[PDB]
Amino acid sequence: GSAMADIGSEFEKTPSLTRRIDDTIFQNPMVQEAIRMGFSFKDIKKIMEEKIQISGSNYKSLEVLVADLVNAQKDSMQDESSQTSLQKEISTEEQLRRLQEEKL
């Protein structure tokens, strides 16, 4: 029995962060309504891709979606040891170095 909320106090940092969006955001408009209530984009794409992968299809209604969201972020477990840190996007942020005249 704990006395203080050690499982989540600020929730500022995340278990993953990637520069690519998910194609499930565009195909299923219930996603944008979930973020509009105050949820994170990463959480909605994650619960969608996992639900479709395991069950075979998207959520029925926002009622089921938001219930499973609060449940998953409160109390869930996952295993992501062997992750592929790879992408097809260009590093256009590196190209700004051509403008910076002040460099060693």
Alpha carbon 56 to chain centroid, angstroms: 20
Q: Residues with Cβ < 8 Å from 49, sequence gap 6 or more?
A: 22, 24
Which residue carries 């051509």 as its tokens? 98
Query: CA 77 to CA 61: how far, in whole Å?
Result: 24
How many residues would you count in the chain? Answer: 104
**Residue 103 exposure: Cα atoms within 13 Å on the Cβ side:** 6
What experimental approach yielded this model?
A: NMR
Query: CA 50 to CA 57: how far, in whole Å?
Result: 10
Query: CA 11 to CA 77: how far, in whole Å?
Result: 16
Which candidate, 21, 23, 18, 22, places its Cα nearest to that of 83? 18
The two three-digit tokens of residue 49, written as one number = 């891709």
Taking the CB of residue 79, how many other CB atoms lie within 10 A of it?
Answer: 5
Query: CA 74 to CA 7: how far, in whole Å?
Result: 8
